[PDB]
Amino acid sequence: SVQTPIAGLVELALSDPSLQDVIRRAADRPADLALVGPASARVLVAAALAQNGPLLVVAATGREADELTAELRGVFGDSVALFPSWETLPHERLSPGVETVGARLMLLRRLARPDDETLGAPLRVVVTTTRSLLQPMAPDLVDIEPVTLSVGAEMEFEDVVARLVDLSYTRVDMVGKRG
Amino acid sequence: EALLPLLHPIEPTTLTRHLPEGAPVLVCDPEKVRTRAADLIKTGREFLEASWSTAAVGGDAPIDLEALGASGFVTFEEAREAAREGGHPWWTLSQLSDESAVELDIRSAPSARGSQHNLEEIFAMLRAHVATGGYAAVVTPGIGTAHRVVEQLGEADTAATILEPGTAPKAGVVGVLKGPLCSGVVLPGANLVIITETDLTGNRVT
Amino acid sequence: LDIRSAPSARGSQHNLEEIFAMLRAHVATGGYAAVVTPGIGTAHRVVEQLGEADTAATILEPGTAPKAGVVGVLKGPLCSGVVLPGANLVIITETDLTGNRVT
Amino acid sequence: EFAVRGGILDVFPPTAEHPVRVEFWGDEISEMRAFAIADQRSIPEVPVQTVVAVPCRELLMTDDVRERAAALAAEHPTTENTVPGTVPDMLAKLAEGIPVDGM
Amino acid sequence: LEMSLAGIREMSTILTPPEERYPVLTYVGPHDDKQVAAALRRELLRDGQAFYIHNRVRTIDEAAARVRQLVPEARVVVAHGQMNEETLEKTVEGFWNREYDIL
Amino acid sequence: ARRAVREIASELVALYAKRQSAPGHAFGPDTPWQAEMEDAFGFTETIDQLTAIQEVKSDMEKPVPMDRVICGDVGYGKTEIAVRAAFKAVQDGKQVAVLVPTTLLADQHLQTFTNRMAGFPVTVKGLSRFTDPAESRAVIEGLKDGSVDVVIGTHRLLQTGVTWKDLGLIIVDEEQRFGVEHKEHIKSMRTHVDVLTMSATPIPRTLEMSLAGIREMSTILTPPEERYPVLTYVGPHDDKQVAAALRRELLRDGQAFYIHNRVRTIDEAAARVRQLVPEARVVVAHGQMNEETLEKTVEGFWNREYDILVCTTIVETGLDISNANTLIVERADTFGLSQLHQLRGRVGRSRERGYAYFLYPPNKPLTETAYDRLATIAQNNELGAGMAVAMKDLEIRGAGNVLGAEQSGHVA
Numbered sequence A: 001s002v003q004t005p006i007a008g009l010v011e012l013a014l015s016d017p018s019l020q021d022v023i024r025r026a027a028d029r030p031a032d033l034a035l036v037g038p039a040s041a042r043v044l045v046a047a048a049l050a051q052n053g054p055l056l057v058v059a060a061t062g063r064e065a066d067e068l069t070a071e072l073r074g075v076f077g078d079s080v081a082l083f084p085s086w087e088t089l090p091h092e093r094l095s096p097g098v099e100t101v102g103a104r105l106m107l108l109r110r111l112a113r114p115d116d117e118t119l120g121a122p123l124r125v126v127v128t129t130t131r132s133l134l135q136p137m138a139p140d141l142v143d144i145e146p147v148t149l150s151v152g153a154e155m156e157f158e159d160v161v162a163r164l165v166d167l168s169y170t171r172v173d174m175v176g177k178r179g
Numbered sequence B: 001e002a003l004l005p006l007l008h009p010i011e012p013t014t015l016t017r018h019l020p021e022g023a024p025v026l027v028c029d030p031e032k033v034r035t036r037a038a039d040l041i042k043t044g045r046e047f048l049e050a051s052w053s054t055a056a057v058g059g060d061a062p063i064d065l066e067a068l069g070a071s072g073f074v075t076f077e078e079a080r081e082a083a084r085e086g087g088h089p090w091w092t093l094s095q096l097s098d099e100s101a102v103e104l105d106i107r108s109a110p111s112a113r114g115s116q117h118n119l120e121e122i123f124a125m126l127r128a129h130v131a132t133g134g135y136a137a138v139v140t141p142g143i144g145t146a147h148r149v150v151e152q153l154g155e156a157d158t159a160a161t162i163l164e165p166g167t168a169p170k171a172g173v174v175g176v177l178k179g180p181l182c183s184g185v186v187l188p189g190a191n192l193v194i195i196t197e198t199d200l201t202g203n204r205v206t
Numbered sequence C: 001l002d003i004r005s006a007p008s009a010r011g012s013q014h015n016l017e018e019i020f021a022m023l024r025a026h027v028a029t030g031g032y033a034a035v036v037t038p039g040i041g042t043a044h045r046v047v048e049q050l051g052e053a054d055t056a057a058t059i060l061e062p063g064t065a066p067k068a069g070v071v072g073v074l075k076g077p078l079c080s081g082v083v084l085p086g087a088n089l090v091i092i093t094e095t096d097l098t099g100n101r102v103t
Numbered sequence D: 001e002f003a004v005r006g007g008i009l010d011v012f013p014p015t016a017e018h019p020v021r022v023e024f025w026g027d028e029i030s031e032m033r034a035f036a037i038a039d040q041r042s043i044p045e046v047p048v049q050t051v052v053a054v055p056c057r058e059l060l061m062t063d064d065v066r067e068r069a070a071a072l073a074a075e076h077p078t079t080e081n082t083v084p085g086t087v088p089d090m091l092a093k094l095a096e097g098i099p100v101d102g103m
Numbered sequence E: 001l002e003m004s005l006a007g008i009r010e011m012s013t014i015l016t017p018p019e020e021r022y023p024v025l026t027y028v029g030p031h032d033d034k035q036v037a038a039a040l041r042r043e044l045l046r047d048g049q050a051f052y053i054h055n056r057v058r059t060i061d062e063a064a065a066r067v068r069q070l071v072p073e074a075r076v077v078v079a080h081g082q083m084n085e086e087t088l089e090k091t092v093e094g095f096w097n098r099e100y101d102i103l
Numbered sequence F: 001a002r003r004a005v006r007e008i009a010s011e012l013v014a015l016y017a018k019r020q021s022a023p024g025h026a027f028g029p030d031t032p033w034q035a036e037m038e039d040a041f042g043f044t045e046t047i048d049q050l051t052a053i054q055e056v057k058s059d060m061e062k063p064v065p066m067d068r069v070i071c072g073d074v075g076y077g078k079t080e081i082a083v084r085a086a087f088k089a090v091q092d093g094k095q096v097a098v099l100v101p102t103t104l105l106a107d108q109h110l111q112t113f114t115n116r117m118a119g120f121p122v123t124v125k126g127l128s129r130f131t132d133p134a135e136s137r138a139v140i141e142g143l144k145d146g147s148v149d150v151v152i153g154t155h156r157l158l159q160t161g162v163t164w165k166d167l168g169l170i171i172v173d174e175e176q177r178f179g180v181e182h183k184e185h186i187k188s189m190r191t192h193v194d195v196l197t198m199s200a201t202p203i204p205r206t207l208e209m210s211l212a213g214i215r216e217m218s219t220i221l222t223p224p225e226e227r228y229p230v231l232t233y234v235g236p237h238d239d240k241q242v243a244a245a246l247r248r249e250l251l252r253d254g255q256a257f258y259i260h261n262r263v264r265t266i267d268e269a270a271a272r273v274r275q276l277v278p279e280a281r282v283v284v285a286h287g288q289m290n291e292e293t294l295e296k297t298v299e300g301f302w303n304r305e306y307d308i309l310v311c312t313t314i315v316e317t318g319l320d321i322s323n324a325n326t327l328i329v330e331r332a333d334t335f336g337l338s339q340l341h342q343l344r345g346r347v348g349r350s351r352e353r354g355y356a357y358f359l360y361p362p363n364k365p366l367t368e369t370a371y372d373r374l375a376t377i378a379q380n381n382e383l384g385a386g387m388a389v390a391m392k393d394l395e396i397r398g399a400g401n402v403l404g405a406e407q408s409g410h411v412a
């Protein structure tokens, strides 16, 4: 397809019997599975495990998460997504980027509701960094109901503006930035 | 949010809980992930003690830094234990070799960085590979950059076809493709050889 | 000059097997292959590795030239190897195979 | 370094592996043998050929350098309370002819 | 002015970013030494550098001294207008070549 | 005194006899892997080292539990004997431990044990002060199941909560620096299992053959590679010379010891160092810090995070930073001959040439004994002027580390 340009090439790469051996070994869910290979093989091995179902992939730094995330976008499209890391520390007196927070909560809701097509395709590979892997989070964040806006929906206006106000949306007289 | 364990006191949960049940966790380069993780714990420690020091907070009772330790970074061992206790296997992929490891039959593509003789040796490597009947493919993130590689392939005793997106190469001809790939891969088990233009010019074009 | 540097297997044993494979192909053609190891007690180890990689190896007599058709493990002072295709010669150092410098 | 004893001169040239002891008789060397630093006893299994004791500093201690070391030594005399590492001591010992550090 | 002076001079304007460049996170508040130390160390953790601005030129050296007291692992240097261009330009050449850590 | 020494000899010979009649599983000859591990050595074994390995292997093979010392200078290669003996004990199925006084040595010996014993199914693990309590409480301490074949650890291995499963060999390094309680602990372990100690301080040979029956000690005097002497400069404290020397040592990406024993002013002293070399990462270290901060700072200096370490003599003499090969002794007149020699020895051990700067203050007239002393070390000489006279002092505390008595009352 047009979204995944190198899907067939990764299919041909997965014809290799060692990757197939990784499929067979990962099928019965072993406790320990240690794999050794070059860096360029990451996208392959990930795409290997994705053959058995969804999975999380933790890269070292954020740059590796972006690189591998794009490489996996070349094979899965919108099915693979990235869980970005905070720009600040959990107890630093600075809020992280509104776009990073939005991507985090949006990915968490996409994981919670894979069938909701308005959020995107169901998730296959979720790539992140060590930061977002370790840094915990409140479990009630996915329950926060977002504001769904579609042409033709029946919503009263004051409920919409009040709901956005409750979602930490800054009310201005002229939209310039996100949030 | 820095005051979240004191404003919204709910026992936090890790990221691995939100994953679908049974979804494995693949940690790439586990040692760099480990050391870096330690560095995050040290840094968050420092920012917690600094931004919320009783000398700088205020006049009455302090903020109970131990209470704010809950949302702090979770150590590597605890993240592995919670991920395993949630039904998510903790699998690793390292670059350093190990005797007790499933060493994949996968090797990196030859990078001709800083050598046009090695570059012609890469074109000729693809030439000998496709003369044997092997699968060769060139992944180029640039839109239209694949055509120049095609011309140089038909020019240097090779066959190049702009493979349509989402397709695998056929034997005998090199299949130049557009897509996102940083470094190439050589798989002799699948008779496949994938070269990126990063390997040809030594340039990362994300 | 028509001289190319040696392939340095970083330590990933697939690169090691690949290097021993290109040595096997070079000596199958008829070219000269030499593995120079400055360390004492590491030449026999390279002979064993080549035997596991199915390659004919020989610890060369000090001062000789590698015989055509057999890889010659040699004990001599070298840092990094050199590939001379004009002389049909491939010299690979122990340093390139193990990533360590013997002083 | 070198040590002087009755009819026996011990000397350690800067280029020789083992220090050499030479036995003089009259006006010519009677014997030569290399010894060990530890026990100060001779090593007979090391054959000693002609040894060439080259200088140990990149200079020669002539009378002219003592003269100029006395002209320069005239200024900054500091006759009393000579500091160890200063230049009155250095130039004073150069006028006295003995080699010193930093010369 | 771009439209009025278009007859004698042509002007292009690049308003579109090259990629997704993010707005910096700005924190205003009281000068806390521990916060500055933690921030500079965080910038040092990615092998980055930091600009420390101190306009008072008579205390800029003392300011850099206090900064090094806050973070000993930082390589801090000063650069101001009272310096001659020859020293300042070399200081900048060092700060660009990662010879220092905090300017 | 003659009545005060036999009390010591009693404990000595009683330990030798309790060791002689004790039941301990001897160690068989070297297995096939031992040859490959010994030949994976990067360098070349030395004759004193080969004889030492033969003696250590034989004492392990003899039914009497081993109690042997290894005497040699810092930079002569006894740690290789440690790793080879530990490997030999592993091949017979017995897990081993290595006891170090400071955590830095636990990390250094940990990395050497990793590199020398890599490629074999041998999990090495260490328990320092900075090992997180998760891995510590779980992996390291919980390794009474044969999970660890060799553990490098600090004094935390001597608390009550520890327990071993078939402890086969104990390796002690710098036994003098341990605490008294820890010392009696290790001596309590001596009778039950094989021990093997390493020492950088020499002993008088008269004591070596005087106490040869109770405790065998092997000496290494063959240098593994010619460690050329450091270049010493005695002189007045000039800032330009200090800065120039520090920048030269920084050129080869090296590190330097700056010594300012007056703790009260050490901070200010370091500041003045930063006045001379602004691009230098300068840190302080002294015994008044709690060990949790001090060992972290010294760790940062060993991990090349800092370039110049201002410290006191207590801290400097006891570190093995191979990358540090330049020494600055401010107020060199205040130090004794022995202390100056110890300070100097801690630099210039690796393949790099070391430099030392003994500086006296120029604002006050130097004393007569400082003039004489500084003159002895000035012309660098191994003669009987004092290098040997102050070498005996280096052997006094060595004897104190060998025998149980510390009191110098009967000696004086």
Ligand SMILES: Nc1ncnc2c1ncn2[C@@H]1O[C@H](COP(=O)(O)OP(=O)(O)O)[C@@H](O)[C@H]1O
Binding pocket: F043, F044, F045, F046, F072, F073, F074, F075, F076, F077, F078, F079, F080, F112, F200, F224, F225, F320
């Ligand atoms: N035979 C040798 N030749 C040269 N260097 C050696 C030799 N053996 C060990 N070394 C080096 O010297 C150090 C060995 O000594 P070390 O392990 O520090 O213990 P010690 O200093 O007590 O002997 C190591 O850093 C090692 O790299």
